[PDB]
Design a protein around this ligand. Sequence first.
Ligand SMILES: CCCCCCCCCCCCCCCCCC(=O)OC[C@H](COP(=O)(O)OCCN)OC(=O)CCCCCCCCCCCCCCCCC
Ligand SMILES: CCCCCCCCCCCCO[C@@H]1O[C@H](CO)[C@@H](O[C@H]2O[C@H](CO)[C@@H](O)[C@H](O)[C@H]2O)[C@H](O)[C@H]1O
Ligand SMILES: CCCCCCCCCCCCO[C@@H]1O[C@H](CO)[C@@H](O[C@H]2O[C@H](CO)[C@@H](O)[C@H](O)[C@H]2O)[C@H](O)[C@H]1O
Ligand SMILES: CCCCCCCCCCCCO[C@@H]1O[C@H](CO)[C@@H](O[C@H]2O[C@H](CO)[C@@H](O)[C@H](O)[C@H]2O)[C@H](O)[C@H]1O
Ligand SMILES: N=C(N)NC(=N)NCCc1ccc(I)c(Cl)c1
Ligand code: SF4
Lengths: 69, 70, 311, 156, 174, 104, 83
Amino acid sequence: MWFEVLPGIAVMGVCLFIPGMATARIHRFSNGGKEKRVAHYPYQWYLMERDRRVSGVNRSYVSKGLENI
Amino acid sequence: TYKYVNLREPSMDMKSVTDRAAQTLLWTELIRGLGMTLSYLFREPATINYPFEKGPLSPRFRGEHALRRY
Amino acid sequence: MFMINILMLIIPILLAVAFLTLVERKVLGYMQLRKGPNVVGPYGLLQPIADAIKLFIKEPLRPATSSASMFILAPIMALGLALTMWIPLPMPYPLINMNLGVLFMLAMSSLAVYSILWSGWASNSKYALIGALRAVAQTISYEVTLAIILLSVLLMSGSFTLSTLITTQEQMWLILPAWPLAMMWFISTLAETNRAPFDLTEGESELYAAGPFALFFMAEYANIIMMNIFTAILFLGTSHNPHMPELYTINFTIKSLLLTMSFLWIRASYPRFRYDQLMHLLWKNFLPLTLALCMWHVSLPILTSGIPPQT
Amino acid sequence: SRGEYVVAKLDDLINWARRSSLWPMTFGLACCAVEMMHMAAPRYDMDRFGVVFRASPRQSDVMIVAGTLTNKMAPALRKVYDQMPEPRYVVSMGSCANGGGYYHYSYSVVRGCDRIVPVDIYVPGCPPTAEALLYGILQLQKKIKREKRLRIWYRR
Amino acid sequence: MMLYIVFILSVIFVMGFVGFSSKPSPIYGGLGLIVSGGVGCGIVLNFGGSFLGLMVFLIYLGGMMVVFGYTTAMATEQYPEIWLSNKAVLGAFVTGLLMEFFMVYYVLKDKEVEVVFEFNGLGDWVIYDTGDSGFFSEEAMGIAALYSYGTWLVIVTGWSLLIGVVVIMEITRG
Amino acid sequence: MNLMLALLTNFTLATLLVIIAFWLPQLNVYSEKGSARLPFSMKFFLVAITFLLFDLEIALLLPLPWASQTANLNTMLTMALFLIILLAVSLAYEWTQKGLEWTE
Amino acid sequence: AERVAAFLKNVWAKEPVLVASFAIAGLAVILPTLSPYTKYSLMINRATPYNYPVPLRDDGNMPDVPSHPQDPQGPSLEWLKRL
Ligand SMILES: CCCCCCCCCCCCCCCCCC(=O)OC[C@H](COP(=O)(O)OCCN)OC(=O)CCCCCCCCCCCCCCCCC
Ligand SMILES: CCCCCCCCCCCCO[C@@H]1O[C@H](CO)[C@@H](O[C@H]2O[C@H](CO)[C@@H](O)[C@H](O)[C@H]2O)[C@H](O)[C@H]1O
Ligand SMILES: CCCCCCCCCCCCO[C@@H]1O[C@H](CO)[C@@H](O[C@H]2O[C@H](CO)[C@@H](O)[C@H](O)[C@H]2O)[C@H](O)[C@H]1O
Ligand SMILES: CCCCCCCCCCCCO[C@@H]1O[C@H](CO)[C@@H](O[C@H]2O[C@H](CO)[C@@H](O)[C@H](O)[C@H]2O)[C@H](O)[C@H]1O
Ligand SMILES: N=C(N)NC(=N)NCCc1ccc(I)c(Cl)c1
Ligand code: SF4
């Protein structure tokens, strides 16, 4: 019956699901639990480089707040 | 006695011409063809599970020869 | 950590291609009142594995080619480029976040025609070379409309970044303002991927083997999936919740799966175009409309005051 | 030993793959081709066994000779056999292909396709039923299951 | 070092040119140009020209070079001659590589060389700009200006392309 | 660096699959079993050349999403339509001159 | 008026694809001149501040130049908030 086509579809679907899921969780793991910073333009890159120096550990994703004021 | 398979004049009024333009541009007859293959997907197939199931035969079936006894 | 990410894209792509061969056969079967593979593994789930192993241990019968380098080059180019097409795709986050991602996909896809051309040269047979040139002519012809249709859509998105298509469709799928382009885009991808009713390479030769045959097949089916993932993003934008990116990945995968199944659905439903007829479908039908809709989509945001932002 | 054991399992694996993915090139010469079509038709659905409906000669593993092989046709059939990549098997289907059948005494007919190519399975009948042909394909699968290519390789 | 990426790409750029300029079979000559085009795009990419880099790929390689290969397969070479089989091609190919290697070796040893004219060898990064923090691509701004500033350029460019269509139909009708 | 690694991985894997696809155990011990006018229509040349010219026009339309951000919209819209109209005139010329026909 | 109407009906019956193309291309050329919203596209494009607004040295006779961004002088984007 038609629903016996579903197992092949499910395997296909899980295979297509892994790329997107893996990238999202790898980004969080490598960026301190946040979204990976997007820098398409020089201004965004400039702020990301400034964050790296401000962090004190050379990690642009390590944020400093009022505790540094 | 005979019949014509393909002897018809299309209606040239605006409603009919616009019907054929919509068919040309919106692919309606092609979408209708998709409907028929969709209905077959949801029909039970005709396949039998050979060799666990066998096609039906009759007593007259002509197969392998044999020599008989009294 | 980034190499892990690359592998977690490549390997699932190849596995999804393998099991699309199973799904295509079973979907086609049930539309043909039969079953398709259901013996090799439960519900045919081992059929792709048996086929893959069989092909690779098959004798690699390659006739003395007129160019050894171009015989090897064609499958490497085809498969290498096919996998490259996936690296900017936002699902919802791309592996490589390109500012001009849409343009990168257009440029890489335009190179895929070299594998057709080189494989024609390497065949060492004027008949296969002529078959290659007919396929190249079909492919470049439909590249014209794909590029113009894509440009028309981006005039509502505002940029070449692929993830900006997600933002553009936060309230509404782009298929609503642009269903005329979605129609021609969809048919163009069929003709681009030499899919029926545009599968004239297969039909005309009717009227490669083993692993090297398998590699061209893998590249073809990777492209088919990628084209339908692109269509879903371009016209059926999924909403992205930054705190639950996996809800995007589930919904977007379902749309891509369904679009890919519609490729199999169409293959089951229609006869094949003649070569001159699919050339007329492009040059005398799609292109006039695409040009007119390109003019319209330049004017529309200006006249409605709906110009999207650049950033 | 394990070395023999590893060979035994690898032979099973390659045999399983090859018999599970039998791609036929069908030489539809005459009426026997019709029953071959009914085997691909929905009731028997040979595709469900992993036997794709129509493969190209260069992607084929089994040639099915389905009909009368005339003298005029014999060279062409042998040419297609020689172009098949290995491993390659031949199924002779029907009396004509088996041994000439009804036309055995004709001036223009090859008396059995096994005069032109080696044959693995002979399917009797005029024509064999679609089910009889399917029985023959399944018999070929069992023949492939018995192959011990790697076992013989390592005893060389 | 990755500090010399632009220089390294330009070394491959030249090798691709010595490849097709020695003029082997037009099939292999086309391959050398395709490789040079891709390497040339990488050089443009590393100077901040993303769009210009992708135009080389999209238009030069996917457009013009495809039509070159297409035409070659039709009206020139259908089966390549063995590469470097002809002595003249091999001599020219070797000579260009020998010249190139000497330039590379000398500019790397002294971090400068005088091949006719005098060049610096410190690396191309030294001339780069040091103050960018705008919220847009400047290359994109310039190219987009074709439609505001370049009305005259659009008119003559569009006219030439139309005439190219008319002209090529006249040439080929025969 | 990431894009280079992705490209290197994609084509390196493609290369590995291709070579192994060619060199696998075979278990056999016996001997194994030009630059002219190809007969191809001028019509196929004209398709490729027609594609090229349209592709060059497309290169000029690609900046349109950025051009629409200009304050000189009057000029920009006029020039966009001019270019596309000229592209349409090109197609109309090939069409009416039987350049799109496949007979003869 | 009628001979043109008899012309349109013929092309609509014979070449609906071309009739649609020409119809859409005409609307793309005509509608921008008729639309009342076209004027806003110019204003919105000019209201987007891509670069820094360099302040003017105050010479004592610029009553239309605000001293503070939150003063009431200078261009207002109230029209844009409603739009
Ligand atoms: C207010 C201002 C608004 C201005 C804009 C208004 C625009 C809207 C009105 C215009 C509508 C445009 C329609 C666009 C679709 C393309 C139309 C088209 O090209 O159809 C004609 C084409 C050829 O037609 P033919 O019968 O051969 O005759 C013509 C030659 N004499 O026929 C074909 O192309 C047939 C297709 C062949 C392929 C068959 C396989 C596909 C069938 C299933 C498709 C399913 C639908 C696709 C949906 C995709 C979703 C992503
Ligand atoms: C995807 C990973 C799968 C891993 C499986 C590893 C298994 C390794 C064992 C390979 C066994 C291959 O088995 C062998 O394949 C080759 C294919 O060219 C066949 O063909 C070979 O032998 C025949 C004669 O026998 C020759 O005429 C032919 O030219 C030669 O290619 C052999 O008839 C078959 O015995
Ligand atoms: C509303 C304006 C919108 C802007 C449109 C953009 C510009 C497009 C320019 C396309 C010009 C095409 O012009 C086209 O020329 C040919 C002349 O042979 C005409 O077609 C004519 O020749 C054909 C044969 O080819 C005859 O079958 C047909 O009976 C006859 O009409 C078309 O009727 C006309 O449409
Ligand atoms: C073969 C040659 C083809 C050439 C095709 C050229 C077609 C050009 C058609 C559109 C030209 C005018 O298009 C549109 O018209 C209106 C006039 O109401 C202009 O004016 C409108 O926008 C401006 C902004 O600059 C506003 O200040 C103005 O209040 C508003 O009316 C628009 O700036 C212009 O975008
Ligand atoms: N067109 C179909 N769907 N059937 C079909 N002939 N498939 C081809 C089988 C195949 C090819 C490559 C690989 I890798 C795998 Cl795993 C399977
Ligand atoms: S064996 Fe019988 S059915 Fe088959 S081809 Fe010969 S006559 Fe026809």
